[PDB]
Amino acid sequence: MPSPSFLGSTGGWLRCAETEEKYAMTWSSDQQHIFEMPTGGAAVMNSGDNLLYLARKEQALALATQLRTQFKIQDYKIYRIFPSGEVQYLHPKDGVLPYQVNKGREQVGRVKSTIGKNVNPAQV
Amino acid sequence: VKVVVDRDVVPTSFEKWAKPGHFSRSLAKGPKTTTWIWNLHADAHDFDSHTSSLEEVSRKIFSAHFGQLAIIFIWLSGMYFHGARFSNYVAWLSNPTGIKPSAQVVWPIVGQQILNADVGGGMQGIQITSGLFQLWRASGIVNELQLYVTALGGLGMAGLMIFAGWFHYHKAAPKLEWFQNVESMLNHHLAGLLGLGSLSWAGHQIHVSLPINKLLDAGVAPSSIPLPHEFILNRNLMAELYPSFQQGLVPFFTLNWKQYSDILTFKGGLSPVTGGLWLTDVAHHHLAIAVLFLVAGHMYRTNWGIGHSIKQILEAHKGPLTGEGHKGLYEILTTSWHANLAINLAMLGSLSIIVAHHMYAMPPYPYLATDYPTQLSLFTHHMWIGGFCIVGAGAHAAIYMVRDYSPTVNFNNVLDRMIRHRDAIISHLNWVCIFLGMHSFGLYIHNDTMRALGRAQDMFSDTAIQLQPVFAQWIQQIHTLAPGNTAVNALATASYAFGADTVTVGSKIAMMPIKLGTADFMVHHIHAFTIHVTTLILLKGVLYARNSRLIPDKANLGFRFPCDGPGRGGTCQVSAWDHVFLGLFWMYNALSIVIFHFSWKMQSDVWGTVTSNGAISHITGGNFAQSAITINGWLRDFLWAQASQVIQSYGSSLSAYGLMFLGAHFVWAFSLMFLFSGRGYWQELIESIVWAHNKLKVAPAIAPRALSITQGRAVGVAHYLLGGIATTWAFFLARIIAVG
Amino acid sequence: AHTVKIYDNCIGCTQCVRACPLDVLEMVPWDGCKAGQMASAPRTEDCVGCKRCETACPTDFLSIRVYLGGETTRSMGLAY
Amino acid sequence: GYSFPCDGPGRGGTCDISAWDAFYLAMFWMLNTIGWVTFYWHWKHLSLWQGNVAQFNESSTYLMGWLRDYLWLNSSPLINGYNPYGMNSLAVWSWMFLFAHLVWATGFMFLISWRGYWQELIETLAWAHERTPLANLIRWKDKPVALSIVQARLVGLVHFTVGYILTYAAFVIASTAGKF
Amino acid sequence: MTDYIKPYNNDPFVGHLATPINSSSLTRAYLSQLPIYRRGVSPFLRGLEIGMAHGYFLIGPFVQLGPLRNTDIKYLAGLLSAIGLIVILTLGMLLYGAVSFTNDSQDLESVDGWRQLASGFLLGAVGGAGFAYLLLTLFS
Amino acid sequence: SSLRMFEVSDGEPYPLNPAVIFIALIGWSAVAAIPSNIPVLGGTGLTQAFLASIQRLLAQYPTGPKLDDPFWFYLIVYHVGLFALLIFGQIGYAGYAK
Ligand SMILES: CC1=C(C/C=C(\C)CCC[C@H](C)CCC[C@H](C)CCCC(C)C)C(=O)c2ccccc2C1=O
Ligand SMILES: CC1=C(C/C=C(\C)CCC[C@H](C)CCC[C@H](C)CCCC(C)C)C(=O)c2ccccc2C1=O
Ligand code: SF4
Ligand code: SF4
Numbered sequence A: 001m002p003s004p005s006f007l008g009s010t011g012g013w014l015r016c017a018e019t020e021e022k023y024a025m026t027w028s029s030d031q032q033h034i035f036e037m038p039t040g041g042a043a044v045m046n047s048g049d050n051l052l053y054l055a056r057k058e059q060a061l062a063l064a065t066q067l068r069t070q071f072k073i074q075d076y077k078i079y080r081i082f083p084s085g086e087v088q089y090l091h092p093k094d095g096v097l098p099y100q101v102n103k104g105r106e107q108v109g110r111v112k113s114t115i116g117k118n119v120n121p122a123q124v
Numbered sequence B: 001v002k003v004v005v006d007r008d009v010v011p012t013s014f015e016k017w018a019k020p021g022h023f024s025r026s027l028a029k030g031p032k033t034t035t036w037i038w039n040l041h042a043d044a045h046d047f048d049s050h051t052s053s054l055e056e057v058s059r060k061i062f063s064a065h066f067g068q069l070a071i072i073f074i075w076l077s078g079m080y081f082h083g084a085r086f087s088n089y090v091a092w093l094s095n096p097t098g099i100k101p102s103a104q105v106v107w108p109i110v111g112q113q114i115l116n117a118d119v120g121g122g123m124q125g126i127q128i129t130s131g132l133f134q135l136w137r138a139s140g141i142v143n144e145l146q147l148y149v150t151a152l153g154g155l156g157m158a159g160l161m162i163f164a165g166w167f168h169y170h171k172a173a174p175k176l177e178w179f180q181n182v183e184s185m186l187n188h189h190l191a192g193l194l195g196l197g198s199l200s201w202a203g204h205q206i207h208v209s210l211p212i213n214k215l216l217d218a219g220v221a222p223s224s225i226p227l228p229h230e231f232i233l234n235r236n237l238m239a240e241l242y243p244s245f246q247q248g249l250v251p252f253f254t255l256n257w258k259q260y261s262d263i264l265t266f267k268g269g270l271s272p273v274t275g276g277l278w279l280t281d282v283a284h285h286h287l288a289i290a291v292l293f294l295v296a297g298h299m300y301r302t303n304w305g306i307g308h309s310i311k312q313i314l315e316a317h318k319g320p321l322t323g324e325g326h327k328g329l330y331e332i333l334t335t336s337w338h339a340n341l342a343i344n345l346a347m348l349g350s351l352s353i354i355v356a357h358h359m360y361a362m363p364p365y366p367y368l369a370t371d372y373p374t375q376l377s378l379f380t381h382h383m384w385i386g387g388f389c390i391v392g393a394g395a396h397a398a399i400y401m402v403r404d405y406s407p408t409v410n411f412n413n414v415l416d417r418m419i420r421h422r423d424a425i426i427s428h429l430n431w432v433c434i435f436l437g438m439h440s441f442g443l444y445i446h447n448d449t450m451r452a453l454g455r456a457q458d459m460f461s462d463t464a465i466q467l468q469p470v471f472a473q474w475i476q477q478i479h480t481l482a483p484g485n486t487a488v489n490a491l492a493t494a495s496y497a498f499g500a501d502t503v504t505v506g507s508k509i510a511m512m513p514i515k516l517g518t519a520d521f522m523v524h525h526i527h528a529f530t531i532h533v534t535t536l537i538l539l540k541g542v543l544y545a546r547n548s549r550l551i552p553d554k555a556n557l558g559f560r561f562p563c564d565g566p567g568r569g570g571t572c573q574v575s576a577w578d579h580v581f582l583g584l585f586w587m588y589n590a591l592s593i594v595i596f597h598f599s600w601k602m603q604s605d606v607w608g609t610v611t612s613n614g615a616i617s618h619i620t621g622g623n624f625a626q627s628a629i630t631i632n633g634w635l636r637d638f639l640w641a642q643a644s645q646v647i648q649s650y651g652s653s654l655s656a657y658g659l660m661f662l663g664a665h666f667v668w669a670f671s672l673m674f675l676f677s678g679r680g681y682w683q684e685l686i687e688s689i690v691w692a693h694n695k696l697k698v699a700p701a702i703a704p705r706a707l708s709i710t711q712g713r714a715v716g717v718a719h720y721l722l723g724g725i726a727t728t729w730a731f732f733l734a735r736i737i738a739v740g
Numbered sequence C: 001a002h003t004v005k006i007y008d009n010c011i012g013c014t015q016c017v018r019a020c021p022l023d024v025l026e027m028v029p030w031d032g033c034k035a036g037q038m039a040s041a042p043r044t045e046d047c048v049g050c051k052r053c054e055t056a057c058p059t060d061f062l063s064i065r066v067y068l069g070g071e072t073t074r075s076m077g078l079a080y
Numbered sequence D: 001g002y003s004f005p006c007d008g009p010g011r012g013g014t015c016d017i018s019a020w021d022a023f024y025l026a027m028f029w030m031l032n033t034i035g036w037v038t039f040y041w042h043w044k045h046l047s048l049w050q051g052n053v054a055q056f057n058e059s060s061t062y063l064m065g066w067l068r069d070y071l072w073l074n075s076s077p078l079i080n081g082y083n084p085y086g087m088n089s090l091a092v093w094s095w096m097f098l099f100a101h102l103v104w105a106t107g108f109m110f111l112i113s114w115r116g117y118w119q120e121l122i123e124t125l126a127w128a129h130e131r132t133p134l135a136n137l138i139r140w141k142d143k144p145v146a147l148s149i150v151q152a153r154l155v156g157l158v159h160f161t162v163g164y165i166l167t168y169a170a171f172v173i174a175s176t177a178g179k180f
Numbered sequence E: 001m002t003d004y005i006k007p008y009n010n011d012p013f014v015g016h017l018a019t020p021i022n023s024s025s026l027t028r029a030y031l032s033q034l035p036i037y038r039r040g041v042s043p044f045l046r047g048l049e050i051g052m053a054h055g056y057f058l059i060g061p062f063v064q065l066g067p068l069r070n071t072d073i074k075y076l077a078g079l080l081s082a083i084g085l086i087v088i089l090t091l092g093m094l095l096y097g098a099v100s101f102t103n104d105s106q107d108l109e110s111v112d113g114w115r116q117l118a119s120g121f122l123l124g125a126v127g128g129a130g131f132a133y134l135l136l137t138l139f140s
Numbered sequence F: 001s002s003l004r005m006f007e008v009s010d011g012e013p014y015p016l017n018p019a020v021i022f023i024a025l026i027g028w029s030a031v032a033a034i035p036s037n038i039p040v041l042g043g044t045g046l047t048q049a050f051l052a053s054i055q056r057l058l059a060q061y062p063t064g065p066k067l068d069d070p071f072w073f074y075l076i077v078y079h080v081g082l083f084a085l086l087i088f089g090q091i092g093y094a095g096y097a098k
């Protein structure tokens, strides 16, 4: 997919990036613009969705946070596993995490006092 | 170019002074915390952290310019006063050698009158090392009346600047349009300030030189000195002291310039009468600089259409490795008040160091080379000034990527590349630092091992012949043969530090052909090590200030922030301001080693005495021919033998330089309280004291809290430097007075 | 990796996911609060533990705790 | 537990808050206080070994007497272990006194500056590792990281201790055996 | 024509993907020609030249600058320290293949070809220290 | 010792070997720096070295600087001239076509 062009190397051709899981984001980009990578200088944003490679998860979420402040665009980030497993970890509900959703659940939640008592009565 | 003034914008009222923190609504409504007390002063000078209207930020910094300028004028107007009311400048004008400098007296209150150093000239006091007497003698000042008139004339100029910084603001105010005239700004700074400044002082030392040159160097009493106006009211007096003044601006138009050769010369070297550079070479020098600045001050677009401009100049420079090079740099410097300050602090900071070097190399003032305390003090003075200034250049070149850099507005692909291949710049500098460290200080470990081990230092003598007198020796030889050959109009070298075997002595050695050897290659590379590390950490803070690999959302946090948290293994001290905080420390180590090198090597091989039965006998006779190669000699013959001149002074008048010496270690080790502990433990420490304060209700409304995480480090470096300069300040001012 | 435990002090002002870098927590409908939201962290395997939610956490004693546990590639935030 | 970094840089800051941080703070006072007792005890014998007791009870009242007559005069045979002429027996000790100030000041690297700066620098080193040809074939096992916030202070305390211990372990032998 | 072909292709047709001073388009081919990672060869030869290059100059430093450098015997101190460090370095380099154990199917860059180049490195280092050994003897 | 002319493609080792010769002329000066190795190298070469060797700064060692000064002067003259050609190369070059 047409992606922004960047010069300066650094990010690409890293063995660790090849052997480790990589992140792939995308954005609508209805208009030609110019933005900045969280790890690079400046680059021109082309029309349509744009797929890039990222080596860190915080790098994958800070770019989405930066895009939301510019214009109003829904963001999609997909997180791939080492072999070839591609799972949708960002927006599995497709609803924005701060806003309220219907699909609700509780993971790792202790409902005890506040000073301590670290024992968990039930994990699920 | 247009007179666009916004007359009356801010009124003159004491209302804002009644509110502590009027400059920020965040620092006004909630003063309920001790931390607010420190935030009121930490952000008091961070003018870009208040309002964003550049028409007001430019109308808050040019105000601080005139304010600081008024402070400097109040500071200078007192120096002419102290050298008249209680001093010895007139007696020193008659007898310059036996009378030590002094311009500060103490009072009989608690027995402190022991500080009244017996300097001579019928006046006792405290010795001075500011170069005031040399500057005043080079200015033709003789009588005390000429001091008071200059001081009273300084009060007027000092008041006018307060009524100016209070004029273009509470009374007047130029628009924002008056500041994008950078083209019109360099046409008045390089021609009106630099040009007319280098010309006005040039026209002074042509008619004021003979009260110093053709009088005070002959042997006339200060009472027999005529008046400066008696030489101008009668052109024939100037004509007799210089047989070129009879013409009086007649061959100046005829282009018969050679007829003005009695004051305008290019001799070189020093004068064997005064003790410094020639009084006639500096006049011609400033004339040559003045005309050059009158030409260089016409380079940018005014309002007539001719000349270049910072715009298209940078819009034209390209380059293969640069890509879209130099373009947009105009928008970089014309929009961010900050952006100009780093290049200024960088150039002017290196400038103070370079001029410090030019001080001791060729002494420009009469009776300055023999005055060893003043010379030693002035070099290291400007040395540390430029150290602070260059680190401030890094402090703000780090500000730019965070506060005023955008991926749409201002653009240079050169700066883009400095941030695109940013991981390569520091990688190069890193390997350079390590190579210059594991060897330069590695060889120190090596030689210090060779001595304590035995016969290894003996076999190191042949290597001691290496490196030293191998490089830079031919450069000095070039300068020996530079006059006559590559300088037909020069009868002397650039300085007598270049001319071999040529020694100029005026009862005390002024300059020496600094014969490098033994360990100058060692200390110069200790310098280069501490220079590359300083440039590395500061340039790291510059270009990593925007895009960081660890935390991608770096621009959100800020510049003077603590960190992020215990995540990622530990994110701690990652701000560019901390690269400056530690950058101040490696600059500290750099300037410390440089001042050590300069100071001690001087009396090692340069500074000394002369007798007729022999030749040259130094204060400390050629010691660092061996005591510099190892670390031990730097505290066996250097840091050890200095206690005999700083402590053995209580029986004399140099007792204060011992108290400050031993007391500067106190505040330095007091910095070891903040640079090692954490706010968490100390915040648990207040709440117990606040419990005792809640027991008697003596708890203040202002809730006691610990210092900020960043403020603690700012105070820590403040004490590490203050306690880390006042010791060598007391040391440089200890021996040089006893061995003067 | 790190162990995320949510106190009962929650007000549901979404301060977690607003502050949080890689979205460890998540807002879930709950029947025992004023605003009606509760923070929950399913992706605790990806948590780094930067402790920026305790800053934005309003309560007297914070409502979102993350006790320091083991360290893996997901919790070190390294790109290699 | 006992050894943990902080609670979070917020709510004013929790820098050095664990009980282990209190231990790491306490060791600093231990070395200096136990060194005060020794600096005092080192005069109550060298003043009578030379027989001139009138030095102490007259000059030790002020700190400058502690500076000029102990840290300077007694250190003459120490530093003169290997002079630029004839080195003698007190060479190995005069070397240790320097190697001490090295190790001691080496600790100042781990104590004054924290850990994140080293993370951002080690990442550049790792980048240069795989990017450089020939050397790209060499690969490590455990990923290079900086010391833990707890282990940083502990290892730096190890340096601040042993360097200080050797700082006083080389002065005693040489300075006492030089003049007896 | 969008932006007129990337401001002059970022100046006269740079390109140079695997070049930026790591190895020029001539030097990257020189690396393929270089025997340390030479194409079309396996067992011994990928090494061998490694030792014949390293051990050849390992005689250098300790002949003129080593801890022994002031008598006539000092021509041997440059070789004893070199050969001792050669044995140490050979063990240290051979241990890398023992640490690696993931690419047992890729025998070249992992274990088999790795030892089948360090095997040449041993004879190369020792022999190369002996090759430059007999080069300065006729002039002395 | 020879001209080393052969192919037009041999025109890229021609900027390669002098590129090594510059560094070789630098390294040759670097390797002959020891104050003790100069006495043993100059005896066989010169007839003057029989009576005594080493001329310090009297003649032989200034030849290096007296070899640099002409080369610097040559390059200075050629660039001062190049600034006066006003966009027209008046010096022949062995390029164009192959
Ligand atoms: C002591 C200390 C504090 C506490 C620092 C404090 C409390 C500063 C105290 C300074 C003030 C100026 C002293 C109180 C004096 C009052 C202002 C009263 C003055 C009234 C008249 C004398 C004018 C920290 O916050 C801290 C944080 C991180 C690492 C180390 C430390 C640390 O060591
Ligand atoms: C250099 C440095 C590192 C990096 C430290 C590293 C990479 C450790 C390097 C160790 C090398 C391998 C040498 C270790 C060998 C020692 C000379 C002796 C140890 C041998 C036994 C005692 C175990 C940090 O992690 C750090 C963290 C927090 C504050 C400051 C710093 C800091 O200054
Ligand atoms: S930080 Fe606590 S109170 Fe705030 S929204 Fe999250 S769970 Fe609710
Ligand atoms: S532990 Fe760190 S990453 Fe996880 S939710 Fe809290 S602040 Fe965010």
Ligand code: SF4
Pocket: B562, B563, B564, B565, B566, B570, B571, B572, B573, B678, D005, D006, D007, D008, D009, D013, D014, D015, D016, D114, D149
């Ligand atoms: S609270 Fe202190 S130890 Fe913890 S991350 Fe912040 S600076 Fe580091």
